[PDB]
């Protein structure tokens, strides 16, 4: 493996290993996509690379599919200290 490490770079998007939550529930994803429910925890497997699409891993399920970059949020609800 080899990564591009020159010096320092800014950050904006989520990185691999960050827990993202779904904005809505998806029972029937596109043809070749993963399914999930509303408020599902997933781990960023890799960085987006399909134009507004991220690859996460469903905990409960355990599969790996693409997710709408515009359908993910930062796990942070008004519950649990």
3-state helix, strand, coil in the chain (%, to 5): 5, 30, 65
Method of determination is: NMR
Residues of the domain holding 8: 1-81
H/E run at residue 58: strand 53-58
For residues 57 and 45, is the Cβ–Cβ distance under 8 A?
yes
DSSP tag of 56: E
The enclosing domain of 58 has a CATH number of 2.30.30.40
* 71 contacts: CB under 8 Å, gap ≥ 6: 22, 23, 24, 26
For the chain, the domain total comes to 1
CA angle 56, 62, 1 (to 5 degrees): 55
Please give the C-alpha separations between residue 79 and each of 58, 71, 75, 76, in angstroms, as whole numbers. Answer: 22, 21, 11, 8
């Amino acid at each position: 493996g080899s990564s591009g490490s020159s010096g320092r770079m800014p950050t904006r998007r989520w990185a691999p290993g960050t827990q993202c939550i779904t904005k809505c529930e998806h029972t029937r994803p596109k043809p070749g996509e993963l399914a999930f429910r509303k408020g599902d925890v997933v781990t960023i497997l890799e960085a987006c690379e399909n134009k507004s699409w991220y690859r996460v891993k469903h905990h409960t399920s355990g599969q790996e599919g693409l997710l709408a970059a515009g359908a993910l949020r930062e796990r942070s609800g008004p519950s649990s200290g």
